[PDB]
C-alpha cells in the first residue's frame, strides 16, 4: 500500500509509486527520475499514463520496454495541463533526466515535490521565483550538519589532475571508473577528455548512455574496450580481486590500474579535505573513493528551504525511524525561527 508522502492531495496523482499495484484513485503516475528505488514496479506490462522528462521516457521505452502509448514526456520550464491540473517540470540537478514537479492545485494551493535533488542557488531564478509554495515534499537524504562534501567542480578537478599525472608518469596505466546506475557521468567523461581517449564499456551500459541526450556522445564513448584507456565496470568489481581479474583480461597492454569509486558522503569527509585524499593501494592497483554527490549537502538544503519559505515540509527520505523524523523536524524549526517565516 502506497504511503501518504507519495500522494498529491486534491489530485488523481502519485509520485514515484509504481511498486504498490493499482493505486486506488490514481489517474496519472509521475516518475521524477530513472533510479531503481523510484521506478520499482514499472515494466512492458504497465498500462497507465506515466508522466516524466524526455530523457526518463527514452530510458522507460529502451531499458524497461514500457510501450510508447503510455509514455507522456513533458518539456522542462513549461506550463502544462495534465488531467485538468497545471504542472511544471524543473531540472533537479540530480542525474540525467531528473526533475522536480510544481503542482498548481485547483483550490489555489501550490506544491513542490523535489524528487531527488542537489539544491543550488540557480534554482532561486527558475520559475520558482514567481509564486508562493505552500507544501514542500523534500529530498532529505543528507539532512544533518555532519554531512559536508565539496562542490562537484572541486571533485572533478581532483580526479582529472590525479588521472593525468598517473598516466603521464606511466603510459601503460589503465584508468577504471565504477558505476551502478545513471548519474555521475562527468567523472568518467572528464577523465577520458584529459587523456584523449573514449570511454570503454559493456553493450548494456553503452545502450543506457545513448538514451541521455548528451551532446556529441558518439565522440566520447565506445564498446571497443581495446581502443580505450578509460574503462567502466560495475561498482561491485571496484576492489583488488575484481581489478586484478580485469587487468588479466587486457592481454598485457597495461601494467597498473588507477580506479575511482564515486560514492556519496563517507565519514572520512568529517576529517579530510579533497586535496588531502589518498588511495588504498595493493601492488600495482590503487583505488580512490571520491565524494561526488548528486544530493544536497546540509548547508545547500538549508539555504534552499530558507529561501523558499514553505508553510509545511514533508520529508521523502529517512522517514522509517522515529529518531530520523525527530532530528529532521528539529532542523526544520531551527531554520524557520532563524529566517523568520
Ligand atoms: Ni536518485
Swiss-Prot record:
Protein name: DNA cross-link repair 1A protein
Species this protein is from: Homo sapiens (Human)
Subcellular location: Nucleus
Gene: DCLRE1A
The protein's assembly and partners: Binds constitutively to TP53BP1. Binds CDC27, which is itself a component of the anaphase promoting complex (APC). Binds PIAS1.
Tissue specificity annotation: Expressed in brain, heart, kidney, liver, pancreas, placenta and skeletal muscle.
Family of the protein in this entry: Belongs to the DNA repair metallo-beta-lactamase (DRMBL) family.
Induction annotation: During mitosis. The mRNA encoding this protein contains an internal ribosome entry site (IRES) in its 5'-UTR. This 5'-UTR generally suppresses translation while specifically promoting expression during mitosis, when cap-dependent translation may be impaired.
Effect caused by changing residue 139 to N: Impaired nuclear focus formation, reduced interaction with PIAS and increased sensitivity to cisplatin
Function of the molecule: May be required for DNA interstrand cross-link repair. Also required for checkpoint mediated cell cycle arrest in early prophase in response to mitotic spindle poisons. Possesses beta-lactamase activity, catalyzing the hydrolysis of penicillin G and nitrocefin. Exhibits no activity towards other beta-lactam antibiotic classes including cephalosporins (cefotaxime) and carbapenems (imipenem).
Amino acid at each position: 500500500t502506497c504511503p501518504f508522502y507519495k500522494k498529491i492531495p486534491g489530485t488523481g496523482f502519485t509520485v514515484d509509486a509504481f511498486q504498490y499495484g493499482v493505486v486506488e484513485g490514481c489517474t496519472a503516475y509521475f516518475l521524477t527520475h530513472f533510479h531503481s528505488d523510484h521506478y520499482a514496479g514499472l515494466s512492458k506490462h504497465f498500462t497507465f499514463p506515466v508522466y516524466c522528462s524526455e530523457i526518463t521516457g527514452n530510458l522507460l521505452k529502451n531499458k524497461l520496454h514500457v510501450q510508447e502509448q503510455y509514455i507522456h514526456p513533458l518539456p522542462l520550464d513549461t506550463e502544462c495541463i495534465v488531467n485538468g491540473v497545471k504542472v511544471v517540470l524543473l531540472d533537479a540537478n540530480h542525474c540525467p533526466g531528473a526533475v522536480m514537479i510544481l503542482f498548481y492545485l485547483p483550490n489555489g494551493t501550490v506544491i513542490l515535490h523535489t524528487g531527488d535533488f542537489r539544491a543550488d542557488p540557480s534554482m532561486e531564478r527558475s520559475l520558482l521565483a514567481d509564486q508562493k509554495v505552500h507544501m514542500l515534499y523534500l529530498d532529505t537524504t543528507y539532512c544533518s550538519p555532519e554531512y559536508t562534501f565539496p562542490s562537484q567542480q572541486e571533485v572533478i578537478r581532483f580526479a582529472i589532475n590525479t588521472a593525468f599525472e598517473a598516466v603521464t608518469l606511466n603510459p601503460h596505466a589503465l584508468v577504471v571508473c565504477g558505476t551502478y546506475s545513471i548519474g555521475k557521468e562527468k567523472v568518467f567523461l572528464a577523465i577520458a577528455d584529459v587523456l584523449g581517449s573514449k570511454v570503454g564499456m559493456s553493450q548494456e551500459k553503452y545502450k543506457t548512455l545513448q538514451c541521455l541526450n548528451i551532446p556529441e556522445i558518439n565522440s566520447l564513448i565506445t564498446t571497443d574496450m581495446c581502443s580505450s584507456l578509460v574503462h567502466l565496470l560495475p561498482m561491485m568489481q571496484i576492489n583488488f580481486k575484481g581489478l586484478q581479474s580485469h587487468l588479466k583480461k587486457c592481454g598485457g597492454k597495461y601494467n597498473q590500474i588507477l580506479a575511482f569509486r564515486p560514492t556519496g558522503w563517507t565519514h572520512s569527509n568529517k576529517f579530510t579535505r579533497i586535496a588531502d585524499v589518498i588511495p588504498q593501494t595493493k601492488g600495482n592497483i590503487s583505488i580512490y573513493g571520491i565524494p561526488y554527490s548528486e544530493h544536497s549537502s546540509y548547508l545547500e538544503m538549508k539555504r534552499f528551504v530558507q529561501w523558499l519559505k514553505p508553510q509545511k515540509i514533508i520529508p521523502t527520505v529517512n522517514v522509517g525511524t522515529w529518531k530520523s523524523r525527530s532530528t529532521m523536524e528539529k532542523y526544520f524549526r531551527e531554520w524557520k525561527l532563524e529566517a523568520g517565516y
